[PDB]
């Protein structure tokens, strides 16, 4: 009766307000109903599905964007029919989804690196750095290079839209450089060269 279904509703905060899911009462109720229907099928003992560790996103008249997350990719689909004033191409984080019949740009797919993946990458860099008291500089640089190629090859086209990921990447690279410089001399260089 009190419309409490909107309180415990997980949303992809990484997107702007318009891009984020619009928590309309009908749509929130429908998402809760769908989740409850799915939870009913699975016996509570053989397995369990918990609401807070789940995301239900509904595209309807009110919601113009379909939000989902898989394989560390936060993706949002915007159909061109309703709220696509420009079907631009310069943005490389955009997958120009094309229908297999009309062969037209019916939908636009915006990609983003998931927050869990960014946290994992930051943790990997942190454990690389903190486990470097007695370690060659080349080993540290190789570990950083391996982590960076893994992230960039796995999450290509998804870095560009995740400006937080760019900031984290440059911050971690500066961390690695600072660790190496401290390893060389116990004093920060003022005009250290990149060569």
């Amino acid at each position: 009766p009190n419309n409490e279904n909107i309180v415990g509703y997980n949303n992809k905060k990484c997107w702007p307000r318009d891009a984020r899911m619009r928590l309309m009462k009908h749509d929130v109720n429908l998402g809760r109903a769908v989740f409850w229907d799915i939870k009913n099928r699975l016996p509570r003992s053989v397995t369990t599905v918990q609401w807070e560790n789940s995301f239900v996103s509904v595209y309807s008249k009110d919601n113009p964007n379909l939000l989902f997350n898989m394989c560390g990719f936060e993706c949002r689909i915007l159909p061109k029919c309703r709220t696509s004033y420009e079907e631009f191409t310069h943005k490389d984080g955009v997958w120009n989804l094309q229908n297999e019949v009309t062969k037209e740009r019916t939908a636009q797919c915006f990609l983003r690196v998931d927050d869990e993946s960014m946290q994992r990458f930051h943790n990997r860099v942190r454990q690389i750095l903190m486990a470097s008291g007695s370690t060659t500089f080349t080993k540290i640089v190789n570990k950083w290079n391996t982590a960076l190629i893994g992230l960039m090859t796995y999450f290509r086209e998804a870095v560009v839209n995740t400006q937080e990921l760019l900031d984290l990447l440059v911050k971690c690279e500066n961390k690695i450089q600072t660790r190496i410089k401290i390893g060389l001399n116990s004093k920060m260089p003022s005009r250290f060269p990149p060569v």
């Binding site: 310069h90 490389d92 290509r156 086209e157 560009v160 400006q163 760019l166 900031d167 440059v170 911050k171 690279e173 500066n174 450089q177 260089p189 005009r191 250290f192 060269p193 990149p194």
Partner: peptide, 22 residues
């Protein structure tokens, strides 16, 4: 010339990702 790594947010948007690669 400081030697620090600069964040390329808001930078080099005139270039794609498939460029400079054959």
């Amino acid at each position: 010339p400081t030697g620090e790594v600069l964040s390329l947010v808001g930078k080099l948007e005139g270039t794609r990702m498939g460029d400079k690669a054959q």
